[PDB]
Amino acid sequence: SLKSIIRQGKQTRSDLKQLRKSGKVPAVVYGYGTKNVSVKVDEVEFIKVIREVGRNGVIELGVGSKTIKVMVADYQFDPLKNQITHIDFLAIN
Amino acid sequence: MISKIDKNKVRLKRHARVRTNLSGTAEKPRLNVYRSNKHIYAQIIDDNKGVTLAQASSKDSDIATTATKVELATKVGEAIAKKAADKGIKEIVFDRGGYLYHGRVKALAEAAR
Amino acid sequence: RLKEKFNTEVTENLMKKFNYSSVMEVPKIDKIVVNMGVGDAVQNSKVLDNAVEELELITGQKPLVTKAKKSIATFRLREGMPIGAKVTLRGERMYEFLDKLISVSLPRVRDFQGVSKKAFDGRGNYTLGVKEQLIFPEIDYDKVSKVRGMDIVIVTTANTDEEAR
Amino acid sequence: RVNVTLACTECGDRNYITTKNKRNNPERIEMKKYCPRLNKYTLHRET
Amino acid sequence: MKQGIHPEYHQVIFLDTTTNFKFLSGSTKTSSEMMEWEDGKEYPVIRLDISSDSHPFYTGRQKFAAADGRVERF
Amino acid sequence: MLLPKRVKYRRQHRPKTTGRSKGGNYVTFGEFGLQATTTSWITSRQIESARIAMTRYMKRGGKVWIKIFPHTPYTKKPLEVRMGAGKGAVEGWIAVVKPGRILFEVAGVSEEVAREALRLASHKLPVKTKFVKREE
RNA sequence: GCGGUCGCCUCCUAAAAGGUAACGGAGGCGCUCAAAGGUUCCCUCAGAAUGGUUGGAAAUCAUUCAUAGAGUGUAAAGGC
RNA sequence: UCUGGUGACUAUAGCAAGGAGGUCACACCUGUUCCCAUGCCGAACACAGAAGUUAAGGUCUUUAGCGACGAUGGUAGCCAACUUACGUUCCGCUAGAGUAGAACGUUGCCAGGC
Numbered sequence: 001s002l003k004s005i006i007r008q009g010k011q012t013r014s015d016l017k018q019l020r021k022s023g024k025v026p027a028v029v030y031g032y033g034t035k036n037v038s039v040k041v042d043e044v045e046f047i048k049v050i051r052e053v054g055r056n057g058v059i060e061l062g063v064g065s066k067t068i069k070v071m072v073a074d075y076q077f078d079p080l081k082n083q084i085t086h087i088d089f090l091a092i093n
Numbered sequence: 094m095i096s097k098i099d100k101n102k103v104r105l106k107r108h109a110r111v112r113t114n115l116s117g118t119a120e121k122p123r124l125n126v127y128r129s130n131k132h133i134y135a136q137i138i139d140d141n142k143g144v145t146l147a148q149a150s151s152k153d154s155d156i157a158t159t160a161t162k163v164e165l166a167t168k169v170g171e172a173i174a175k176k177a178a179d180k181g182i183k184e185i186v187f188d189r190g191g192y193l194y195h196g197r198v199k200a201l202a203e204a205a206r
Numbered sequence: 207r208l209k210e211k212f213n214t215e216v217t218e219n220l221m222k223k224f225n226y227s228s229v230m231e232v233p234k235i236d237k238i239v240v241n242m243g244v245g246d247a248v249q250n251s252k253v254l255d256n257a258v259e260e261l262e263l264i265t266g267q268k269p270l271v272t273k274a275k276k277s278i279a280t281f282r283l284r285e286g287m288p289i290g291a292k293v294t295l296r297g298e299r300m301y302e303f304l305d306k307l308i309s310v311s312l313p314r315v316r317d318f319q320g321v322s323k324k325a326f327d328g329r330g331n332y333t334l335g336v337k338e339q340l341i342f343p344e345i346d347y348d349k350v351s352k353v354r355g356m357d358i359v360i361v362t363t364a365n366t367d368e369e370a371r
Numbered sequence: 372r373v374n375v376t377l378a379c380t381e382c383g384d385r386n387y388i389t390t391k392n393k394r395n396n397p398e399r400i401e402m403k404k405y406c407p408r409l410n411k412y413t414l415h416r417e418t
Numbered sequence: 419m420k421q422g423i424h425p426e427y428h429q430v431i432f433l434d435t436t437t438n439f440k441f442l443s444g445s446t447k448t449s450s451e452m453m454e455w456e457d458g459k460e461y462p463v464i465r466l467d468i469s470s471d472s473h474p475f476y477t478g479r480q481k482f483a484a485a486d487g488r489v490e491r492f
Numbered sequence: 493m494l495l496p497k498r499v500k501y502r503r504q505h506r507p508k509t510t511g512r513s514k515g516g517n518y519v520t521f522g523e524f525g526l527q528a529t530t531t532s533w534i535t536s537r538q539i540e541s542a543r544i545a546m547t548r549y550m551k552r553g554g555k556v557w558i559k560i561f562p563h564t565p566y567t568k569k570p571l572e573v574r575m576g577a578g579k580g581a582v583e584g585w586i587a588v589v590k591p592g593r594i595l596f597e598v599a600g601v602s603e604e605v606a607r608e609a610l611r612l613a614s615h616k617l618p619v620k621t622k623f624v625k626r627e628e
Numbered sequence: 629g630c631g632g633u634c635g636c637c638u639c640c641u642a643a644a645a646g647g648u649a650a651c652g653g654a655g656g657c658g659c660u661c662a663a664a665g666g667u668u669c670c671c672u673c674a675g676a677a678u679g680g681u682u683g684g685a686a687a688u689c690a691u692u693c694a695u696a697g698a699g700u701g702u703a704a705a706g707g708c
Numbered sequence: 709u710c711u712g713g714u715g716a717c718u719a720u721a722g723c724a725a726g727g728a729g730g731u732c733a734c735a736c737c738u739g740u741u742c743c744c745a746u747g748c749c750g751a752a753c754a755c756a757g758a759a760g761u762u763a764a765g766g767u768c769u770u771u772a773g774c775g776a777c778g779a780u781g782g783u784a785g786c787c788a789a790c791u792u793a794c795g796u797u798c799c800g801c802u803a804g805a806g807u808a809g810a811a812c813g814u815u816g817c818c819a820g821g822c
Binding site: 245278280285288331346349 | 677678679680681682683684685686687688689690691692
Binding site for chain 8: 419420421422423424
């Protein structure tokens with residue numbers, strides 16, 4: 001799996017639901033060397049997480065600098081849509 | 094084999110419930126004694142910020158001895174740090190304080206009091 | 207005698223039966239709670255009061271059942287006198303070896319207890335027998351339950367020569 | 372319970388009023404109270 | 419000592435058929451035989467027990483009814 | 493008629509019906525779950541008139557696992573009388589569902605049966621349903 | 629109309645100050661106590677099983693798991 | 709600066725295991741001869757003495773497995789606001805609990821033999 005996200009923006013007004021139909025998700029890495037410096041991902045490149053890791057392993061990040069193995073841990077699945085919101089990573093140290 | 098009880102536990106535990114009304118203000122500083130296995134103590138205390146106001150000791154060794162209820166128990170029952178302090182409130186966690194630690198409560202009842 | 211017989215054999219074993227660190231982790235005998243019972247709520251209980259003057263040292267307190275299910279529960283009757291061995295009577299009618307004055311059910315079990323609180327019941331007329339059956343030949347329940355100085359049966363067992371059962 | 376009445380003989384005035392059961396203690400009781408015009412706790416007769 | 423419970427009771431003297439092994443604490447009253455210093459110099463009349471005459475415990479005795487018996491001419 | 497036994501109070505308040513779901517948004521006891529998409533009060537009588545029927549399609553085949561139990565017992569007056577002289581005696585038992593909740597769970601049996609069985613079962617409940625495939 | 633209610637105390641409804649209605653949903657009071665009152669000491673809860681004439685799974689005192697799930701003269705909440 | 713003693717902090721201060729030392733000082737240790745006293749047994753309650761010991765406690769050092777404090781990113785809820793008929797939806801403010809990554813085997817108050 002080589003999947004790349006970027007540093008998205010905070011101070012968000014909740015006007016994002018409507019820029020959300022066009023694909024994205026939040027994502028926030030845990031671990032030292034950085035912080036909850038969030039990253040934004042898109043879905044139809046995750047229409048192929050099917051082959052990426054399974055659920056337990058490694059992903060590239062390419063998030064500017066400190067592009068290392070990071071683990072998306074939690075689940076924030078959503079009702080009524082088959083959409084997703086705030087899946088998020090962590091550093092391996 | 095079964096649970097044996099420590100006793101310093103309940104000694105300070107009772108000092109707690111007993112330390113809810115009496116407290117030396119140095120206008121009437123209480124003097125308050127850590128009985129030991131062989132010896133006894135005392136100390137005047139002021140109770141405004143927890144500093145140590147006045148002090149003596151039984152175990153201080155101007156003289157050592159035995160017989161925990163000795164005239165050494167009543168010389169610790171006399172000693173003071175000379176000041177403007179009057180008839181204090183005898184802090185007691187030990188039963189029959191009017192007679193048990195009366196070794197302390199006896200001799201000082203005239204000069205510190 | 208017996209109080210020293212809580213010494214005459216035991217100080218060396220109870221200084222060796224374990225191989226702990228210091229002398230005092232290696233125990234002594236655990237204390238006893240000499241208790242009696244009744245199966246009548248009135249007169250046998252009101253008139254089973256001395257057998258303690260016989261065996262225990264307590265004059266006679268009046269504790270009752272606590273847990274007291276459907277038909278156990280009663281109030282204030284002297285069925286269980288608290289004659290627990292504190293220190294003076296802690297050499298009570300217990301370590302009297304008058305449990306041989308029956309010659310039945312000496313070795314009852316392969317072991318004693320999974321709860322360290324042991325129970326050693328002179329069921330029948332096994333105990334207090336040096337007194338002739340004058341008024342002691344009627345209803346009389348016992349309750350010799352107390353813990354010992356060993357966590358399980360294991361080392362409790364093959365030095366138990368004190369009461370030999 | 373029934374109402375009673377106490378009074379110090381010296382003063383001869385019944386001001387204090389207490390209560391007492393007619394079964395718990397039917398025997399006439401008497402305690403020391405501070406009756407007026409005496410400045411001392413005298414014996415009161417619960418009549 | 420806090421008195422106000424048990425009455426009067428101390429040690430006594432008793433000699434058995436064998437080994438005279440019953441001398442522990444007592445509350446037993448009776449009429450004195452003859453007193454000692456290896457044991458009581460006082461009313462000696464704890465009487466006599468089975469304390470050392472024979473135990474069943476570490477001992478032997480006679481058996482139960484019998485075996486087949488139709489082996490010695492019946 | 494899934495009802496309880498011991499209840500402290502017998503007259504209660506109508507439950508609140510607004511907002512999303514809380515718990516039971518997934519499926520455990522079997523591969524296949526039937527989700528809910530709107531809000532209503534399922535009323536024990538549906539459940540046993542939509543359980544025996546699903547099993548009469550199942551012909552005593554595989555096994556089911558119910559994910560909804562009616563607690564709050566609803567009450568109702570008998571003949572139409574005046575307004576207001578007390579409260580009517582309890583006569584029903586209700587369960588409240590919100591969008592995003594698995595109501596039924598089954599295992600082992602083929603997906604053709606699953607579809608052609610939950611479509612049979614939903615035709616009794618007043619809530620609109622949607623199939624769920626344990627879509628990890 | 630018939631029936632039932634009419635005074636005082638506790639809780640929910642009552643929307644995180646106080647106050648707040650209906651023939652709305654639950655319980656109580658018209659006392660008792662010389663001690664269950666004042667003061668100085670001293671102590672400690674349940675649901676847990678041990679195997680102890682006897683066992684009424686529960687008749688006993690222990691022992692340890694015991695966190696207030698106990699006990700408060702009287703209903704309920706707030707407290708210890 | 710070590711321990712013993714008093715007075716602050718939201719168990720960050722813990723129960724669950726252990727590790728190791730000494731009796732300057734807390735401990736286990738001797739009985740009723742005495743002060744007091746268990747409606748019950750001087751173990752709690754007291755006394756004169758300590759020949760005997762360090763298990764345990766006591767103190768540090770280890771286990772983040774045992775539980776609280778739990779910084780962000782979201783999200784439910786909500787105060788205004790423009791719409792529509794709301795079990796809503798958009799637009800602005802304040803944004804939780806729970807879940808993590810964590811901090812995590814107390815900061816000191818003032819004295820006594822040093």
